Structure formats: C-alpha cells, structure tokens
Amino acid sequence: VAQISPQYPMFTVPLPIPPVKQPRLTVTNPVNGQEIWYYEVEIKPFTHQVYPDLGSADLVGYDGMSPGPTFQVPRGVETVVRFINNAEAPNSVHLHGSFSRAAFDGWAEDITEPGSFKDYYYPNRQSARTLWYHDHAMHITAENAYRGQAGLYMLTDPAEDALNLPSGYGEFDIPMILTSKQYTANGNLVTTNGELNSFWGDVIHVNGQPWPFKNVEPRKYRFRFLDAAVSRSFGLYFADTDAIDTRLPFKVIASDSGLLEHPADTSLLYISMAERYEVVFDFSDYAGKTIELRNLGGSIGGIGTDTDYDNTDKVMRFVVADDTTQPDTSVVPANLRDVPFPSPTTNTPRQFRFGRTGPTWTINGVAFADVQNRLLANVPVGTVERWELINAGNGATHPIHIHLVDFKVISRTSGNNARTVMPYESGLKDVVWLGRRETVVVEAHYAPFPGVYMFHCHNLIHEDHDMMAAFNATVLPDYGYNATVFVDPMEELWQARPYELGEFQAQSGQFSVQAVTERIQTMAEYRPYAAADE
Ligand SMILES: *[C@@H]1O[C@H](CO)[C@@H](O[C@@H]2O[C@H](CO)[C@@H](O[C@@H]3O[C@H](CO)[C@@H](O)[C@H](O)[C@@H]3O)[C@H](O)[C@H]2NC(C)=O)[C@H](O)[C@H]1NC(C)=O
Ligand SMILES: *[C@@H]1O[C@H](CO)[C@@H](O[C@@H]2O[C@H](CO)[C@@H](O[C@@H]3O[C@H](CO)[C@@H](O)[C@H](O)[C@@H]3O)[C@H](O)[C@H]2NC(C)=O)[C@H](O)[C@H]1NC(C)=O
Ligand SMILES: [Cu+2]
Numbered sequence: 201v202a203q204i205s206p207q208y209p210m211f212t213v214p215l216p217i218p219p220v221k222q223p224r225l226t227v228t229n230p231v232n233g234q235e236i237w238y239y240e241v242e243i244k245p246f247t248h249q250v251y252p253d254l255g256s257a258d259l260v261g262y263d264g265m266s267p268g269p270t271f272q273v274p275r276g277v278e279t280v281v282r283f284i285n286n287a288e289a290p291n292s293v294h295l296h297g298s299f300s301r302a303a304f305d306g307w308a309e310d311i312t313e314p315g316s317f318k319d320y321y322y323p324n325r326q327s328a329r330t331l332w333y334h335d336h337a338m339h340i341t342a343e344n345a346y347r348g349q350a351g352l353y354m355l356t357d358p359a360e361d362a363l364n365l366p367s368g369y370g371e372f373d374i375p376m377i378l379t380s381k382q383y384t385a386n387g388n389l390v391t392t393n394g395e396l397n398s399f400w401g402d403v404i405h406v407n408g409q410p411w412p413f414k415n416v417e418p419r420k421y422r423f424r425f426l427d428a429a430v431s432r433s434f435g436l437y438f439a440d441t442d443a444i445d446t447r448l449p450f451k452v453i454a455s456d457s458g459l460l461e462h463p464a465d466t467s468l469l470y471i472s473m474a475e476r477y478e479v480v481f482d483f484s485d486y487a488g489k490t491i492e493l494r495n496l497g498g499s500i501g502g503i504g505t506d507t508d509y510d511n512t513d514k515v516m517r518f519v520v521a522d523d524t525t526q527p528d529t530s531v532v533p534a535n536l537r538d539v540p541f542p543s544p545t546t547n548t549p550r551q552f553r554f555g556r557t558g559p560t561w562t563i564n565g566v567a568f569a570d571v572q573n574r575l576l577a578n579v580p581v582g583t584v585e586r587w588e589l590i591n592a593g594n595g596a597t598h599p600i601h602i603h604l605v606d607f608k609v610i611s612r613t614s615g616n617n618a619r620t621v622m623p624y625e626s627g628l629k630d631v632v633w634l635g636r637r638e639t640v641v642v643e644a645h646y647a648p649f650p651g652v653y654m655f656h657c658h659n660l661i662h663e664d665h666d667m668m669a670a671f672n673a674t675v676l677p678d679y680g681y682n683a684t685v686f687v688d689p690m691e692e693l694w695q696a697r698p699y700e701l702g703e704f705q706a707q708s709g710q711f712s713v714q715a716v717t718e719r720i721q722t723m724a725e726y727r728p729y730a731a732a733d734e
C-alpha cells in the first residue's frame with residue numbers, strides 16, 4: 201500500500217557502523233583477582249537529520265546516538281555497565297542473550313528514573329554470540345526502543361576466531377540492525393504512542409539509516425542480522441539489480457545463542473523481532489554488480505500479517521568492486537561446533553496460549569500488569585522442560601522470547617500447512633516466531649541461576665499491551681550461592697540510585713575512581729555468577 205512517510209533519496213547514504221564502546225576503568229575483583237571492565241552509558245535526548253531537505257527527528261539514545269555503541273567483550277571477562285538516565289522517561293536495560301541474575305536482567309518494573317543510574321553486573325560466560333541491549337521499562341518499551349534505546353553486544357571467543365570466518369568489526373564483520381519506522385511530513389518520527397495492534401513502519405533502516413548503500417569488495421563478509429523493529433518481521437533475500445527477483449545463495453552460520461552445528465545453505469531468511477542470525481555472503485561471483493538486500497512481500501509470504509508498503513521490499517544496496525585489494529583469507533568451515541543441546545525430556549510440555557482478552561494481548565488470559573496472576577510457572581533450577589507455544593489465531597503473529605535460557609526448537613505445526621522447523625533453527629535460540637496459526641515446542645535447561653524472569657511476545661506493541669508473564673527458577677533453602685539476595689529482581693541492594701549531573705561530568709563524588717572501585721568490589725564479594733563456574 202502507498203508509502204505514508206515522505207519520499208526518501210534511496211541508496212544514497214553510506215551504511216553507518218556504530219562505534220565500539222570502551223570501558224572507563226578496570227576494577228580488581230577481590231574474590232578471584234581478575235579485572236572487571238567498568239563502563240558508563242548516558243541515556244539522553246538528541247536530534248538527527250534523517251531526511252536531507254526536511255526538519256530533524258527527536259531521538260533518545262545510549263550515549264546520545266542510535267543505534268547505541270557496540271560492546272565487544274571476550275568470554276571470561278565480567279563487565280559492569282552504569283546506565284545513567286539523563287532523559288525524560290524511565291528506563292530498564294535488558295541484555296538480551298545473557299543469563300544475567302534477575303536484578304541485572306531488565307525486569308520491566310526494575311526502572312531507573314530520570315536523574316538516577318543503575319549498575320548492571322554481567323557474566324559474559326556463555327557461548328560466543330551476538331547479544332543486544334535494549335530498553336524494557338513496563339508499558340513504554342515500544343516507544344523507548346523506537347526512539348533509539350537499542351545497541352549490539354558481541355561476546356567473542358578465540359576458539360570461534362580460530363574458524364577464520366570473515367573478521368574485523370566494520371571491515372568484513374558488519375552489524376545489520378534492522379528497524380522499520382514512519383516519519384511526518386517535516387521529517388520527525390511518528391510516535392508509537394496510541395498504537396495497540398502493531399506499528400509496522402514504512403521506512404526500512406539498517407543501523408539507524410533509511411535505505412543505505414555500502415561499497416564492498418568481491419569476497420566474503422559476515423553480516424550480523426538483528427530485527428530491532430517494533431513490529432516488522434522480514435523474509436530477507438539478496439538479488440542482482442540486473443535480475444531483481446532471482447534469489448542468490450548464502451550461508452547462515454549462527455542463531456540467537458551462537459554457531460549452528462554446520463552452515464545452513466539458504467536463499468530466504470525469515471527473521472522476526474529480537475532474533476539474531478549471522479550470515480556469510482560471498483560477493484566474489486558478483487564483481488562489478490550491485491546486489492540489493494530485499495524483503496518478501498505478501499506479509500512475509502503468508503507467514504505473517506504485517507502491512508507491506510511501496511518500499512518495504514527494499515533494505516539496502518551493496519556496490520561490488522571489480523577486484524579485492526587484499527587476499528580473502530576467510531573460510532566457512534563445514535563443521536562449526538558441537539552445539540550444547542539440553543538433555544531431551546519426557547516431561548509433558550507446559551502449554552502457553554498467545555491471544556487476546558478483549559483488546560489486550562495476553563498469555564493464558566493474563567496481562568503482565570496483573571501482579572497476582574502473571575507468575576505462570578515454577579521450574580526447579582536444573583530441570584529441562586518443553587514449552588508448547590500456541591498461536592491459535594490467523595490475525596497476528598508472535599515471536600516468543602524466554603529470558604535466562606537457550607532452547608532447542610523441537611517442532612513447528614502450521615494451521616495453514618505453511619512450514620515446519622527451518623534449517624537455521626537447527627541450533628540454539630532464545631526467540632522463536634509463531635507465524636499465523638503456528639504452534640512451536642521448545643526444549644530448555646532452566647539453569648544455572650535461580651530467580652524470577654520474564655517471557656513474552658517480542659512484538660513491542662503486543663508486549664506493552666500486555667503480552668508478557670513470568671517464571672520462577674526455584675531452589676530449596678539449603679541451596680547456597682547467596683540465592684536470597686539474587687532471586688528477587690527488585691532486591692533493594694541492586695536498585696537504581698540518584699546522581700547529580702555535575703558529579704557525572706567532573707567524574708567526582710560517586711563517579712570518582714575510589715567510589716566506583718569500592719562499589720564494584722562490594723558487588724563482586726556477593727559472587728553473583730559462581731554457580732556457572734567450570
Ligand atoms: C521464587 O522462588 C524463590 C525460591 O527459589 C522464593 O524465595 C523463597 O521464598 C520462601 C518463602 O518466602 C523463603 O522461605 C521463607 O524464609 C523466611 C526467612 O528465613 C521465613 O521467615 C519463612 O518462614 C520462609 O521459610 C525462602 O527463603 C526464599 N528463598 C530464597 C532463595 O530467597 C520466592 O519467593 C519466589 N518468588 C515468588 C515471587 O514467588
Ligand atoms: C555472599 O555475599 C557475602 C557478602 O558480600 C560474602 O561475604 C563477604 O565475603 C567477603 C569475602 O569476599 C568478606 O570480606 C572479608 O573481610 C574481612 C575483614 O572484615 C577479611 O579478613 C577477609 O579476608 C575478607 O576480605 C566479607 O566480610 C563478607 N561479608 C559478610 C557480611 O559476610 C559471601 O562470601 C558470599 N557467599 C557466597 C556463597 O557467595
Ligand atoms: Cu529483547
């Protein structure tokens with residue numbers, strides 16, 4: 201249907217690459233003698249000139265940019281991030297893909313008010329993967345994410361680096377953060393506020409830029425796809441502009457939780473909100489050609505319900521040079537890793553129905569606001585469970601996300617006989633797309649940390665109104681590991697604290713080296729991640 205947003209100069213602006221975020225300090229952990237990397241991120245308003253001949257757009261971002269800066273963290277290095285609210289509305293930061301403790305996970309009620317900060321303590325122990333950090337504040341997640349609060353967080357491993365995949369952040373390893381928004385006649389954003397169905401957007405962005413281009417050499421690139429959109433799901437394919445409907449082969453090498461067992465040879469990649477897939481595309485057969493990254497129409501080929509607009513079939517263009525300036529020393533091995541699948545279970549699956557209760561998006565008829573009814577499962581730590589995730593309806597779709605865990609996709613059924621499990625769903629995931637009339641069974645090890653955690657649809661409009669619930673990963677009273685201060689996301693020890701902007705700017709008072717060192721060393725003495733030690 202007709203584009204609503206003003207006409208944009210398609211494929212004229214280079215793909216931006218978010219800068220790498222550097223830590224301010226390293227603090228010695230008195231428990232293990234190891235360095236903890238400490239970072240400061242300032243959430244603040246800013247403007248950006250999106251449309252060259254109109255006015256600017258009003259954004260609110262991590263470090264006053266969108267996307268937020270990219271984290272690059274080696275496995276085995278703990279991190280503390282001080283997220284400072286210098287904005288207009290509350291925030292709650294979630295590191296999506298991290299088995300963080302409950303009070304460091306972005307629980308939707310665990311908010312930071314403007315004029316406060318919160319210290320988040322992250323483990324960085326899981327398999328190498330593409331994580332992302334984003335806002336999660338109750339009922340305002342869609343607008344906070346839409347206006348800029350999302351960024352990438354790469355967890356690295358020298359063992360994965362030994363596979364010799366295309367490498368170098370911004371060189372041959374390229375972030376591909378997808379969003380879908382709508383602009384006013386004078387080039388500002390159309391707010392998501394008021395939307396209760398879905399906010400599709402008619403302008404496709406990569407790394408915050410509408411319909412960009414990038415100059416590439418005729419060789420292999422690693423692309424890290426993230427769907428950070430409010431409500432748009434995608435069916436991605438590549439085509440030569442000389443044959444714009446002919447899909448070009450590529451390889452999927454990783455899903456939400458890390459590498460697949462083997463690369464999946466693919467010409468069409470379904471990707472829904474909060475999913476990450478890493479692709480290697482080989483431009484060597486396309487020297488001197490322009491390759492367009494495109495998006496399926498027909499509501500993602502009948503899997504979705506999304507509205508399609510005049511230019512939502514287009515993502516970006518790659519302009520391929522005639523030769524390389526350096527040899528392509530990269531490869532995609534046929535064997536990537538032994539995926540650490542959970543033990544199979546015989547426990548009858550738990551059922552969760554994603555639908556509506558009057559106008560509200562619900563789980564088993566419950567809204568997250570309903571404190572009394574929203575705790576839908578008690579799961580003893582160490583248990584494996586199958587969850588049967590049911591979309592009975594034809595009128596919407598739901599990418600379901602479970603915090604804490606990685607899971608195996610066991611099965612997909614479709615009431616439209618449309619598809620089953622996709623080859624790139626063969627590994628470990630933390631989001632799974634329930635297309636029209638789809639039921640998916642997932643299998644997860646509820647481990648290794650006890651606490652109250654969220655699960656929800658990741659369509660941010662559904663999520664806010666109000667399709668989210670909780671589970672409790674439970675332990676007995678003789679379980680140790682300081683569990684009594686780590687199970688409750690609202691535990692007073694880990695709450696947000698007020699700050700004065702002068703002290704932040706001067707790096708004085710509670711931002712002094714001495715004050716930060718004492719705070720982080722005190723936090724480290726509680727040993728939040730010890731139950732994951734190997
Ligand atoms: C989620 O699960 C955790 C358990 O993994 C629940 O925490 C446990 O709650 C019980 C009952 O409140 C606590 O036992 C109580 O201890 C107090 C203090 O000694 C005592 O006065 C009571 O008679 C009772 O024995 C237990 O200590 C606590 N465990 C931990 C590790 O903190 C938690 O309540 C569940 N959360 C929700 C929201 O249901
Ligand atoms: C659970 O969390 C508590 C509280 O953070 C941990 O207890 C703390 O353990 C630290 C060691 O990191 C104790 O510090 C000690 O200070 C004394 C001097 O006062 C010094 O001689 C020792 O060498 C050490 O530095 C700290 O006092 C202690 N605090 C309390 C209130 O007990 C505890 O280890 C954690 N337990 C687990 C199972 O994680
Ligand atoms: Cu998320």
Ligand SMILES: [Cu+2]
Pocket residue numbers: 294295296297601602603604
């Ligand atoms: Cu998450």
Ligand SMILES: [Cu+2]
Pocket residue numbers: 561596597598599657658659662663667
């Ligand atoms: Cu949904």
Ligand SMILES: [Cu+2]
Pocket residue numbers: 294336601603654655656
């Ligand atoms: Cu969540």
Ligand SMILES: [K+]
Pocket residue numbers: 226227228235
């Ligand atoms: K140090």
Ligand code: NA
Pocket residue numbers: 460461462463464623624626
């Ligand atoms: Na595979």
